[PDB]
């Protein structure tokens, strides 16, 4: 078992130096210097260990980078959120660093683009949505506000009737 | 009604936050769904979540159903009063609170009316006398509408009415389908 969480951690560490080009066990094995693990590992490890992980993509008859076998388009799907009634996938933000790249160069961009930034889940984390159209009135906003959220104490359908008498 | 959501949507816009803007979205279909479904989908936290449940509960958009299994959904009407609500509470600015008539004594910085001015005056010097520092008044203008600093709230509301006048314009709109 050991041995397989090593693997992921030296795929995981390929993904950061900035690769995802798959590879076979065996240069896996070789670089890690694993080669001699043992045979009967080397085979639990190809004929049970990557097959029983589901988020291993498999490419070119070959095993590579490893969270996301699919939908790693490192941008966020605008084209679902257009969709007002179906429109839905604010995530967090460590999520999309560890798909491909850092979140900053893209940002720029997309802080005049699309992208929200909450600070959710805790001030150590982000979390990530798109945006919107303009306010229904130009005013202090808040202060006036705070005295407009309303008429929460009863007798309301009878203030509705007396507004209207 | 389409036009009724959009109305909703702006007048939140112009309400509340982010947060519970982007609640109220999956919200405003309304579906039968629970605060899970809402946790799942949006990925807001459920102590966080509950808070901005408790806020739209309390603010009345909202009705539920127990089953416990609990369900929320919303009663979407209840903003015509919103509307009308608020616009009472952006009158109260409206409405007259100028108080004409009006000295203040600038010693015990005080307030005063037209009615203390029979009692402020001294006949031997000719001119006003507070009632205890005994000092001269002249004009009031305190927490009263003055030169620009509440007239930029009263333009405020100048600019206001034009701005929710496409909404009530949306609220007469909606009263034609009412029909329907």
Redesign the interface.
């Known amino acids: 078992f050991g041995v397989l969480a090593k693997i992921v951690n030296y795929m995981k560490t390929r993904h950061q130096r900035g690769d995802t080009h798959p590879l076979t066990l065996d240069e896996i094995l070789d670089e890690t210097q694993h080669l001699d693990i043992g045979l009967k590992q080397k085979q639990w490890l190809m004929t049970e260990a990557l097959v029983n992980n589901p988020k291993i993509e498999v490419i070119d008859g070959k095993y590579a980078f490893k969270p996301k076998y699919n939908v790693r388009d490192k941008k966020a799907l605008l084209r679902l959120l257009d969709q007002?009634?179906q429109?839905?996938l604010?995530?967090?933000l460590l999520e999309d660093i560890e798909e491909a790249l850092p979140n900053s160069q893209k940002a720029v961009k997309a802080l005049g683009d699309q992208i929200?930034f909450?600070n959710?889940?805790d001030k150590k984390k982000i979390?990530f949505?798109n945006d919107?159209?303009?306010?229904?009135?130009?005013?202090?906003?808040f202060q006036?506000?705070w005295?407009?959220?309303?008429?929460?104490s009863m007798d309301?359908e009878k203030?509705?009737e007396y507004?209207k008498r | 009604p389409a036009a009724l959501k959009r109305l909703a949507k702006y007048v939140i816009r112009g309400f509340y936050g982010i947060e519970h803007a982007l609640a109220l979205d999956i919200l405003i279909r309304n579906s039968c769904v629970k605060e899970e479904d809402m946790l799942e989908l949006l990925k807001f936290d459920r102590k966080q979540l509950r808070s901005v449940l408790n806020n739209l509960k309390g603010d009345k958009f909202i009705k539920c159903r127990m089953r416990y299994f609990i369900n929320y959904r919303t009663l979407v009407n209840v903003v015509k009063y919103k509307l009308d609500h608020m616009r009472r509470r952006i009158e109260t600015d409206e409405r007259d609170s100028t108080n004409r008539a009006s000295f203040k004594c600038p010693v015990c910085s005080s307030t005063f009316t037209d009615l203390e001015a029979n009692q402020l005056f001294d006949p031997m010097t000719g001119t006003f006398r507070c009632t205890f520092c005994h000092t001269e008044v002249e004009e009031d203008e305190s927490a009263m509408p003055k030169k620009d600093a509440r007239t930029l709230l009263a333009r405020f509301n100048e600019q206001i009415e034009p701005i929710y006048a496409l909404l009530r314009e949306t609220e007469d709109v909606n009263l034609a389908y009412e029909i329907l």
């Open positions: 007002h009634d429109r839905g604010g995530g967090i929200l909450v959710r889940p979390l949505f919107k159209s303009c306010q229904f009135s130009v005013d202090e906003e006036k506000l005295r407009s959220v309303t008429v929460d309301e203030i509705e507004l």
